[PDB]
Scaffold this active site. Sequence first.
Site, short mmCIF file in Angstrom:
data_model
loop_
_atom_site.label_atom_id
_atom_site.label_comp_id
_atom_site.label_asym_id
_atom_site.label_seq_id
_atom_site.Cartn_x
_atom_site.Cartn_y
_atom_site.Cartn_z
N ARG I 45 0.82 -1.22 0.00
CA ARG I 45 0.00 0.00 0.00
C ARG I 45 0.85 1.27 0.00
NH1 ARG I 45 -5.12 1.09 3.56
NH2 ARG I 45 -5.35 2.67 1.92
N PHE I 50 -0.25 10.35 2.89
CA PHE I 50 -0.83 9.58 3.99
C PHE I 50 0.16 8.55 4.55
CE2 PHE I 50 -3.73 6.44 5.97
CZ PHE I 50 -4.32 7.27 6.90
N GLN I 53 2.34 1.48 3.92
CA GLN I 53 2.38 0.31 4.80
C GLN I 53 3.19 -0.81 4.17
OE1 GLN I 53 -2.30 1.05 4.67
NE2 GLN I 53 -1.78 -0.97 5.52
N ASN I 92 -3.37 -2.92 11.94
CA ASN I 92 -4.22 -3.91 12.61
C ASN I 92 -5.63 -4.03 12.04
OD1 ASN I 92 -5.49 -1.58 13.80
ND2 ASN I 92 -3.96 -1.63 15.44
N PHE I 103 3.64 0.65 9.11
CA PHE I 103 3.56 1.71 8.11
C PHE I 103 4.28 2.99 8.51
CE2 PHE I 103 0.40 4.47 10.07
CZ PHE I 103 -0.21 3.62 10.97
N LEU I 112 -5.75 8.53 13.79
CA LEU I 112 -5.23 7.19 14.01
C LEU I 112 -4.63 7.03 15.41
CD1 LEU I 112 -3.45 6.72 10.58
CD2 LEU I 112 -5.83 6.24 11.17
N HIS I 116 -3.81 2.36 16.59
CA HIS I 116 -2.60 1.64 16.17
C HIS I 116 -1.44 1.84 17.14
CE1 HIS I 116 -4.30 0.69 12.17
NE2 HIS I 116 -4.83 1.90 12.23
#
Lengths: 62, 135, 255, 20, 172, 84, 33, 96, 155, 261
Positions: I45, I50, I53, I92, I103, I112, I116
């Site tokens: 990804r 952003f 990952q 997760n 990531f 977030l 995480h």
Amino acid sequence: VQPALGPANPFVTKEQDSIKNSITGYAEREYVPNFVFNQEYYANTHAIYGKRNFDDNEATTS
Amino acid sequence: RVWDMRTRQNVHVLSGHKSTVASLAVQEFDPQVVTGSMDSTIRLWDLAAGKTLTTLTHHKKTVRALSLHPDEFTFASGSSDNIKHWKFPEGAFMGNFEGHNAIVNTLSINSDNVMFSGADNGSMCFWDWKSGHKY
Amino acid sequence: EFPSICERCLGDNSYVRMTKEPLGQECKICSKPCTIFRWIKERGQKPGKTQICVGCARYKNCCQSCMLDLQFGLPIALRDAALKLVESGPTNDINREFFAQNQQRLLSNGETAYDSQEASAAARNLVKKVEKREXXXXXXXXXXXXXXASLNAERADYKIRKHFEQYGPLKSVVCSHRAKCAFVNFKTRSSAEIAAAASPDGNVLKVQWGKXXXXXXXXXXXXXXXXXXXXXXXXXXXXXXXXXXXXXXXXXXXX
Amino acid sequence: GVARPAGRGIPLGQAPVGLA
Amino acid sequence: AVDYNAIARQGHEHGELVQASFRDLIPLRARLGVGEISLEKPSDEQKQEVANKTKLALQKILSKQIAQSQPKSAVVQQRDDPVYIRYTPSNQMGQALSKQRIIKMVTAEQDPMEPPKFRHKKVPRGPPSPPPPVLHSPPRKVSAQEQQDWQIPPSISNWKNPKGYTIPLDKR
Amino acid sequence: FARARSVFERALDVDSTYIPLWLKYIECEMKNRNINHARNLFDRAVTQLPRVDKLWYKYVYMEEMLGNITGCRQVFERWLKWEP
Amino acid sequence: KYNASIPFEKKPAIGFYXXXXXXXXXXXXXXXX
Amino acid sequence: NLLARQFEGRHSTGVAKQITKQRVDSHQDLELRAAVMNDILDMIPEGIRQGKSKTILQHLSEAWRCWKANIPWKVPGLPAPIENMILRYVKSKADW
Amino acid sequence: MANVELQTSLGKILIELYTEHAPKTCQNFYTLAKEGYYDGVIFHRVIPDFVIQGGDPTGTGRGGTSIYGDKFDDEIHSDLHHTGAGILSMANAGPNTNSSQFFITLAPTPWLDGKHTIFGRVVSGLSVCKRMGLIRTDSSDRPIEPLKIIKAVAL
Amino acid sequence: PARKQIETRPEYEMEPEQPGQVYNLWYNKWSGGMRQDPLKSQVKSETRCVISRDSGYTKADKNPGSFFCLYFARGMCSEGSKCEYLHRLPKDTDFFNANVDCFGREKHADYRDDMGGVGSFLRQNYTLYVGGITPTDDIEEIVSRHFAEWGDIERIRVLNSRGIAFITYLNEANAQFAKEAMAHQSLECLNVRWATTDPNPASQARNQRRLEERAANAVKKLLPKQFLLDLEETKNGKXXXXXXXXXXXXXXXXXXXXXXX
RNA sequence: GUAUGUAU
RNA sequence: GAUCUUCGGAUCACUUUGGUCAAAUUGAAACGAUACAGAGAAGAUUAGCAUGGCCCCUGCACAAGGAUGACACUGCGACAUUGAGAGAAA
Ligand SMILES: [Mg+2]
Ligand SMILES: [Mg+2]
Ligand SMILES: [Mg+2]
Ligand SMILES: [Mg+2]
Ligand SMILES: [Zn+2]
């Protein structure tokens, strides 16, 4: 099942999110006996006419 | 052009080279079709798709010969330059028979690892497929 | 392998009977053989029909009948002018065949999608781009001409129609932007008399009682009325315009 | 009759055959 | 050269065999980083996989060629199974989302007579797949005597000397 | 721009390995000063044909006028992998 | 008292470096007129 | 066949002309004058300019003409390679 | 409190690990890097502005396990947050489902925080994480050229 | 209700160009000498419709998604009262979609040479090209009288040198409708054609600006309310504190934040 | 003065 | 409606619509009229075959015709210098 995992892309507009085979929507083959489809189709139409008619026209009877 | 024996009807146009496709060779396994042209190039072909796999350019002039080795799984490409000599799927080069100073038309391979190259002079040099030494 | 087709045309019903025909019309844009898909929408409606080939309505991204863009709902021309996203431009008889074939050559080989995030970013940007852009001596000389139903609106058309129609029965309305004037003619004089006193010194005005070469003379009268409005708010061209302004009134009075 | 190997495609939709 | 060899590969739709480095001109006997050289000619269970793959492929093409070649006069076939489908729409403008809607496709059965429905528009063919690295052996030295030894005197006719172009009689 | 920058690209499809077209096409960019435009186009040739010395010298020469010297070396290094 | 839409486009190559180059090119044609 | 011509028109320029007697002498040559355009291209080394490719031919022809007349065809300095090229590809013609 | 070095097909990335805060998160990561588990894995990804990952052995999206067994619990502290551009954190599939996957943020991510497990920050190779995070992708946010992890060194 | 402007109708038979037009059974037209007489020389209409007098209720009005009758705008819709298609002017509500002209006839790729009765779906024209009679300078009073009735106007231009008018319109539906009604009428017959892009740069930019504005309005309904809330909020603020506050709170992204709390 | 094209 | 049979209750029959316009100027051939010019191969007359396509007609035609159907380009250059003399700029 096995889920994906990750943070999930935040931007994602409405248009991207659906899984589409052919642009507008996913399209797949079906195997419904036709009599069921014809029978199904008519009932739906009456409801549509009824709203336009604005009349329920009672229930189907013997 | 690839033709259908029975129904006498062309199936494929192997469209790519930009000049006289002066040689061909044909096999059972992939690289089933081997061209060679004035483009001083070579392709290796998808007989199913009608598109080229590789694009093998290591010649400098017109490829007036190809030929597959009986068993080895290899194909010597000739010319008036280095009489080259190759591997397969990738094709990746193997070596140069070097010593023929003429325009060579023929790359005939034997079962006991003997090449024969005849040129437009009459110059006939026989070679040895393991080393490169012409004997 | 059913078609593009939006949700909007398929219609009210969930179940939909429709017929393919493997080689009907060659597509309008594409100009090559394609498949016609026919269906009915409603009870006694005349049935639909796809007008484009899918190869195109991939690139262009629209309901293969409606041609309204899938994301928004606005027309495809309207979209390309305003948003200017993909920036296509053949609009010819023959060039549009190849150009649109060339995009079908592009998308088929390398699948370059229609990115909707950057598309939506163009819209919200365009929305904000719109907002940032956005007397006693008269009536006496007027009454002298009235004794001896049209009002000259000196100093847009829809607003000129709106503000005057609400003060009486209109005969007809005009405008010239270069002229920068509009002659509002009423059906009755009672309305035109009332509308004169109501719209005197109003925003949206000098409301009086009405009375190659033509392009250059009218464009000269535009620069004259522009400096006339600018001066009143607050030199050789101003004096030369005054001489031209005096010469027109002499021709009007004499004739 | 003829046989073939495997495959076992997943349907996006649930629910019965005729409904939708 | 790590992120640049992805200049020659761009396009092609099938470019992993394309050459890039000088290594490619290096014989297989010296590549350095090679376990073993396989000269054997694969197997029988691939031979019969390939032959099936090719032969099935040609047949689907040959059949479709025969279809266009002959118009099949009166030979009109009815693929007369109504193909049913379900169509899951992807929030297009907004609003109603799904439902799923069962379409029922059918083939309208072409009138036997009607001749072809469109003309043969002729349009220039598109541009080829961008070329590959040339990877020649190193250019040999020439010398000024060699390039003079290939001097080609323009020939002139006894008979066919069209246009004008006068030539003196001491050059004949 | 377009009409100009298409036509050379269009003509380069007809014959890749014509050096005099390569150059002509390069010069016409830098006469209007867009170097970044050309530096990609220069790389394309280099890759497409390694034994065209005329390209290699002309690759660096632009670099000196352009400026940075660290670009010249990475260019000059990858010419030595062909070991001319 | 061909012009319409280009004959056949053939885009440059690929985004390695190039948006600023195009910005200056558009206004220059108006000056050349 | 005639209707399809009437709601389509004739296909792209090419198809195939299929020789015949009218156009055999012409199409014979065309090939010879493109198998000398081959052999020269390969006889010329790796950098001696291509301004001869077309040039070589106007000899070939003149050579042929010369034969038919029976006049000899000595020619001032041209490569002894390309003397033979042309003595050979004449000899062919003079058979057929 | 040991660092780790990642060698990719673009460039080298050095990362501090806050093992004092998260002992298990830096026990799992550190063990797999040394063992040769992250070797030859793609950053499946990549999202401009952003994250990028990684940590997928299967190369699917639904892959990767921990050194403990299958999945382990998160360890959140208020000291460690996503304020910056280049912050190592574990991905997760809920509250208590941390696999090998991690990531590297490219911009600030307040939303977030609390979900995480953060367990490190990139020291050197911040140019590589910005250049790696602007690569051409498919509509399924997958890179067109697989950006591999060549070697994971444990310092 | 309705008016049947002509009950009877018209039956077509002809022998134009006296000595033999032959008639091409394949495409129903005649064929002979004097093709210049066919290119020009269109003969005046026998009737024009009056809007207020003729317009009324129809069988279409009951049906939601109908079109207008072409023959109504021509002023000869023999049915009139019991006509299947609408007998009014196109308003902002009527709507329609891209590939369909207001009268139901499908649009085409890219115009005619001589600019016919329907236009392309690749570019939008709210405009009309005309060729009119020129008495004096009361032409503009005559033009504005007639053309204003057919629909809401944007701007009437009338060039007096060459008897021509570029009449733009508010709703695109009125434009298509207007052209048919105006065409083949007297004030020779007025000539109506679709408008080419007007010459010069400045004017085009002005038109482009109008079209862009039209698109923005169309988009505007679409955009999210928070996005809507913003631009509007920023304009009112013209706020900073509020923005800051919003930022702090934030620290499917909106959905994810919503999901957490 | 046509075979054959150019302009309205 | 018809046949069984409690006045209930069965049973038989089930969704049409080949649409490029819904009413012959402004949405599907151009030719014709008129004017000009008026037919390859380096004197003039003259058979021809090819050649290349975004030019095409006649023709069942992968025959053959249509003027040999008509139309058909040929500066550049990947630039060294030598040696001398004069000029302006660092
Ligand atoms: Mg002929
Ligand atoms: Mg003749
Ligand atoms: Mg003849
Ligand atoms: Mg000819
Ligand atoms: Zn299409």
